[PDB]
Amino acid sequence: PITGSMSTLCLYYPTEAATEINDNSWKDTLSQLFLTKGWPTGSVYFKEYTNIASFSVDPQLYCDYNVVLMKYDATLQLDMSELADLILNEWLCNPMDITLYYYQQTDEANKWISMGSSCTIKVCPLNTQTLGIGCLTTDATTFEEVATAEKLVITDVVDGVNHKLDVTTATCTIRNCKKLGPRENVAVIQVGGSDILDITADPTTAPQTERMMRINWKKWWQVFYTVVDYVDQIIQVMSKRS
Amino acid sequence: QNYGINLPITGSMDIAYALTSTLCLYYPTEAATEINDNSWKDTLSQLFLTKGWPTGSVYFKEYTNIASFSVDPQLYCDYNVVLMKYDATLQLDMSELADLILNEWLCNPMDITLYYYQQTDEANKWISMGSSCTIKVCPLNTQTLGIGCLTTDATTFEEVATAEKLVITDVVDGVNHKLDVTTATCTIRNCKKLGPRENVAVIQVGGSDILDITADPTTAPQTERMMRINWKKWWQVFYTVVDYVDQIIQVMSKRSRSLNSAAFYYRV
Amino acid sequence: QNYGINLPITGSMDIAYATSTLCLYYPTEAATEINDNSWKDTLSQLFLTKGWPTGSVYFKEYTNIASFSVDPQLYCDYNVVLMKYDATLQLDMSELADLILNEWLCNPMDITLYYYQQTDEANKWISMGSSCTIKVCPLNTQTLGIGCLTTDATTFEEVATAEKLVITDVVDGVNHKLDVTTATCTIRNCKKLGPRENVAVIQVGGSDILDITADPTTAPQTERMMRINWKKWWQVFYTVVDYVDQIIQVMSKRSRSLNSAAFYYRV
Amino acid sequence: QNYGINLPITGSMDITSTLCLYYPTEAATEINDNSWKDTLSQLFLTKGWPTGSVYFKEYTNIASFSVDPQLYCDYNVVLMKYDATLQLDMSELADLILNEWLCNPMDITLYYYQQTDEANKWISMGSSCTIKVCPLNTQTLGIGCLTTDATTFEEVATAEKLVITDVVDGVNHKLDVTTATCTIRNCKKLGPRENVAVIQVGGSDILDITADPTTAPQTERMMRINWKKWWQVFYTVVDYVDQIIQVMSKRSRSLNSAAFYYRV
Amino acid sequence: LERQLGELREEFNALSQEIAMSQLIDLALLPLDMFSMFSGI
Amino acid sequence: SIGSSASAWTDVSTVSSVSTQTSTISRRLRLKEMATQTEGMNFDDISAAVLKTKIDKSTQISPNTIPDIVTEASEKFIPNRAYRVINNDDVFEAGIDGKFFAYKVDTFEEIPFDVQKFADLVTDSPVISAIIDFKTLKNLNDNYGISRQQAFNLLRSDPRVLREFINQDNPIIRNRIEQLIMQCRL
Amino acid sequence: EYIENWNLQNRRQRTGFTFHKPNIFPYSASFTLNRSQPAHDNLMGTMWLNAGSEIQVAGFDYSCAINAPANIQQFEHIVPLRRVLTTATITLLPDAERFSFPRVINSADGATTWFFNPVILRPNNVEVEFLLNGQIINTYQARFGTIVARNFDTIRLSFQLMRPPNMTPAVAVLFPNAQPFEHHATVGLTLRIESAVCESVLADASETLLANVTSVRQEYAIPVGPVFPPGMNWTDLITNYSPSREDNLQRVFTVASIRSMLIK
Amino acid sequence: NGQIINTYQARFGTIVARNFDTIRLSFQLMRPPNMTPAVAVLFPNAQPFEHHATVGLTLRIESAVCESVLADASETLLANVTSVRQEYAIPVGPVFPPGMNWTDLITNYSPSREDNLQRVFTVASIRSMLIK
Amino acid sequence: NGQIINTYQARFGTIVARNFDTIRLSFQLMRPPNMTPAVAVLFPNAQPFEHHATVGLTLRIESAVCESVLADASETLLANVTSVRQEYAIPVGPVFPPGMNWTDLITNYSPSREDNLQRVFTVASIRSMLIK
């Protein structure tokens, strides 16, 4: 209804670089670097994760600007897509009680998210008359398997119908979530790769938001330098929080 | 009514405007072997039923190995979707399978035991389908003299493919060649690439995308009829491709050769 | 789009206007009688004289009338089928000429979960394969068979057996049951639509054993069905070579198909 | 004639050669013919090339092909056999063979250095080159490393036959190289080259011709194709040559027009 | 072969001034053939 | 087509735009001397006469080398070539030189030029190989007498008026002819 | 003036109506195809909008005439007028500013639309032919700007699109010789009528006759009669312009001019 | 004055208004009911869009008759006004906006400015008839 | 004038029409309901046909009166016009069509040419009473 007329930075990383540099003072180094580049002391930080999927466990985003380095690995590809989907948009989530209710979807913006320690995800899509479709409502083993022992899962199902769910409440937590829009406050850079990450399970479109960058390397010092030298471009491409 | 005589057609930009379409899905094996059920088809059927699609309208034809599926891919059905299980070691065959079954090839047969041949334009290729093709080609200068190969026998030519079931050669235009295959094993047909085919949509479930349909090096386009998704459990792939099957269907279109008005225009 | 179907043509009578391929098909009788190894090349050089550039004529071989019958294939801008005459293979000759001379569009056929019917007069059923024996039954409104008890097949009223190819016509106005030899044949429900100009038939010997429509009233002999007599195969081949301009003038090319099958399968 | 000025051109809206092929040895090894170059010469004649001016050059490995790289020929189509191993090497190699690099030498035993513009890099070539760095404070003092040390340095590359090094700029750094084994030239990229077209065989078009992360500028010169046999690749090359020729232009430095305008 | 051409070039470049013009025209009147262009040499 | 009825004499197969138009016309009209549609003393006549006297008097000629001499002579003589056309007291002229004129037969008082009647008249009507250019015609008008007879003759490139002019020491025509000579330089 | 033309069409003398920018072209914005795909991956046709006193035509092809003979694609478009004109001074600018931006346009049958992303070339051998009753009176080639037509009633615009001779790589990317097209080619003209002279009554952009008559008919809310089509829609008016309509229109314009000097 | 004195539906080309004091343009944008891949790709559901839909309406006043004096397309007047105002650097006046800015003038059109404008345009109309 | 003026349905032979400028003929071709032995050969129910069915209308305007000028078959104006133009090799004028070709005229009847016709036809009549 308006009329017109014509600061904290964070760089996350996997432990591999930490080992590779073989130092315990790099923090102050990159700090003074940014200082010379025109930043104040104590305005940049650092955080380590162990491995890609482990980073998906209770992901911490809190920073005025977010730059995530992702390392390529073959056998965990779709899961890297999962993590990207998680930290690229803004999710708003509502609870789900699987031993007490029965749930549908209504939106192409309604996804199911599963995070926590470790869980297996089995669902049966339900009929109208609360009868098992190609499985048995009450049997727990007849059901169909959509995820096996996974760190993060972005489940989606066809809308309109009911689906009786089953997961290990002992060791996982699922949220029925809806997307508001992009998480402009976050950006991601993959190393290597072939542009194999997208924000949608959508087959029609997978357009690359200019927040997903790509760089080649052989040693991590070059990588960190290449990032930090271009903090300006990473800044202008993205925006601030909220 | 008035057919085959291409006459202009008047439309307009003055008036705005306010089922029988049959999906025909294919699928590979190890998927099935992991599904561990014989009713999955019925579940897909009932789901499509709730989505607005009739029961008995969807059929599942299965291909065993990609090289096996390469022969005779007569994909005759109102709308066709091919999910291919990717390989990091079997690539060129996927690319050429896409090329073949996504374009329209009008081809005439050959008798290489007798006739010389020569390609004509950048839209003329030689498709070769069958069990185990081992092409043998020998280029010639202007008065039929071997170049890098000896025409007084057969075993000194320059082979271009071995242990292949389906391969589509492209030759230097405007030069004659001698040819050999085992014409009891597989067959080669000289095809002209008439125009893009729109009945099919191919999506790949595996590694990175490799798909290109132009044998042109410069033009390596990304059409819409070529899609890619990841996977770790085929169930979600099926469920999802049915979740967006609306958008997929809206992307493709009716085969421009069987429309009752494509009469006397190459297949109707 | 539609190339123009609803914007009619405009013409006049006052204005004065004053690489293609050709195939052949021959029964192995000729391959026997020839007794040469370099003959096809001679035929090539000849069709050069008559107007075809080298690399524009190909030869195909079929061993029986019955063998060529299954799953027809076509390969050139113009198809010439040289058919041998016989006296006990008449319905097969006519069925093959009907199938290849005429267009067909069919849906697949089953036996499992339906019954079937023809909606009109101009629809037929086609069966092709290794072994095709067809028995059929009509019903009443009572879903009861008249002349064949619906549960037992041995007293069915058969129409086809010991045969490779059959084009059958049954009466409109009732569902049907069939004892198709399923795994050893295959059947489709086709509608013929109109003639095609991409095939021609030259019958050597015999006396016009042909009908292109099973209509008793209309046995329409066309200009594409030609019949000459033979006692020596080289004479047949040459004489065909001598009027290839005429034959090309009798056919037309704007009706070619994309696939090499002379019909159109649309599930 | 009139060089050395930047003299505005007006207009209106009414108005020999050399094709040059490099190839890896394993190919001709798979071929097992020898007269082959002569065969493809005949074919290039048929597509319109003068007889006896087309030259094929042979490199043992892409590493080898990386050191002392020199292209002097009217039209160069360079093939590269991919490997999932040297993605950095191939990227920076296509880079060095895509641009015009204004270069000067360096002596790292007597001075400091810098990068002053975003179009500035430090290129290194040699037999066994392994460079180390140490950025310097505004007081010319080392951080996490000391000008007196040579080991607390920050390693950036290792025995790479070639390397294209870049750092944060406006800041000095004391380095570590072996000069009687390797040379490092301070170079500045200016424009794209039109005498080169890089056909990759195998792979998925992974190149990046800039140390810029934010964009992966893909162009009309980095082409890709798949293979199952070599003569396949060569036939695709020869037949489709005309569109390639249309891609690559005459060397904008070559014409006797760029004289005294940083002409090659 | 080129060398004799260059020598004749130098020669022709200095025999353009020691020619007559009137007689030139009156020559250009008559028609020349193979027989009078190189057989009176 | 620059004019009407494209005639394979005006395509663009191969200063303002008109100059280039007439120039690409003129380099084509050069070959009309090759196809027998002239009425005067053609350019290649002057070329042939220079070739004659030069290849006779010289000392370094030899039967070994007459070939390729005759060729280069044929295809480099007379780089600047002119052409003019007549139509009902109205003549026009174009050349590769980079100019174009139009004027009237009675008085050579120039007329501004048109490029569309021009192409038609040329492509059909007889083309006369200019040998005395417009500079020379206007000047000869100025400082020397002119007869309507004489004028018809000169525009016809008549031998008589030409030679009589040469014999009278009339310097401007001599200078034009010598310029033509000095054009034949191999 | 108007009473005078009245008394002249009474005295059987050649009448004359001068006009500034006459609205003689009826309104009809439609397109035409010569080749069509049901999905529009291969087309060839024309678009044209003729509004007010000007016309804008533009012929387009997706292949840029690569398959066509001799790299040339012709385009025709004719316009007849329902009333002949005289001593017209026409202006001719080669372009289609109205057809120059990507559009989404409705098909002929009316179920779906198609895309348009054209890229402009300049048209060659542009011929504009002002013919009279099937007789050429004015013909103009190879020329733009202001030209003149003495006596014409039938306009033909014929223009050929020539695939360019030779293109810098950024252009060769535009028109891929292979089948898929990723950009579209178009060349066009615009014809504007500034001043004119006619035999009948017309609607200009400087007289209140048409305005005043429509306005008063509305204000006094006269029902529709069988001569004036409903709503004074000048489109229908000029669509079937014919004798009786012409006479009544002359009458109303005359009496409205009579009114004009006094009413205000 | 809020009274719908001329109203029209989707009519194009030419129309007439007897009298009016405001213009209202109300239109409606409609999503494509049925589309094809060329459109389907560039009209997505996802949040980062490539293209953006729009509909434009254009209007040009051609002939009119008014009771209040205004500057026109053919006038010789306003030129004389501005030129006599600039020729000698006349000090900007208490009421006339600087430089005879037509934008600033028609910004707030006051009755006293109206009468001033009338007087000046009239004397200019007189002026023209003497020196062209 | 875009309106229907007069009708005739199933009336044959001679008719009278008051005022018209356009004729429209809408007619139906019917299949016989019953056919005796002779007919079935004429119309095979299948697609191969030999003999084709057709229905025609012959329309002759016997006489009338025109408000413009036209030629006829009972006068002699056109002939005299053409002859006197043909004789002395008069260079064609910029307005009349060549040879007074009547059909080319009618295809593009334009008012100026019309009035010129009327003039020359009055003059032809004038001549026509004096030396026949």
Residue numbers in the entry:
A (entry chain H): 58 to 63, 79 to 314
B (entry chain G): 51 to 68, 77 to 326
C (entry chain F): 51 to 68, 78 to 326
D (entry chain I): 51 to 65, 78 to 326
E (entry chain A): 494 to 534
F (entry chain A): 583 to 596, 605 to 776
G (entry chain g): 134 to 397
H (entry chain h), I (entry chain f): 266 to 397
Excerpt from the publication:
The icosahedral inner layer of the virus, composed of 120 copies of VP2, is in direct contact with the dsRNA genome and encloses 11 copies of the viral polymerase VP1 and a similar but undetermined number of copies of the capping enzyme VP3.2 The intermediate layer consists of 260 homotrimers of VP6 arranged in a T = 13 lattice on the surface of the inner layer. VP4 is a homotrimer of three chains (A–C) associated in an unusual asymmetric arrangement in the infection competent TLP form.
The intracellular TLP visualized here provides the opportunity to study the structure of VP4 in fully assembled virions prior to release into the trypsin containing extracellular medium. In our high-resolution icosahedral reconstructions of the in situ TLP capsid, the VP4 component was poorly resolved due to symmetry-imposed smearing of the density. To improve the resolution, the icosahedral orientation parameters calculated in the previous step were used to extract all potentially spike-containing vertices (n = 16,750). Local refinement was performed to permit deviations from the icosahedral capsid followed by classification without alignment to eliminate low quality subtomograms (54.87%), as judged by the lack of secondary structure detail in the 3D class averages, as well as unoccupied vertices (9%). We found in the intracellular TLP additional density associated with VP4, likely corresponding to the missing part of one subunit in the cleaved TLP, as suggested by a previous report of purified TLPs prepared without trypsin. The structures derived from in situ TLPs and gradient purified TLPs without exposure to trypsin unambiguously show the C-subunit head domain located at the base of the uncleaved VP4 spike and that this form of VP4 exists within the ER in nascent TLPs.
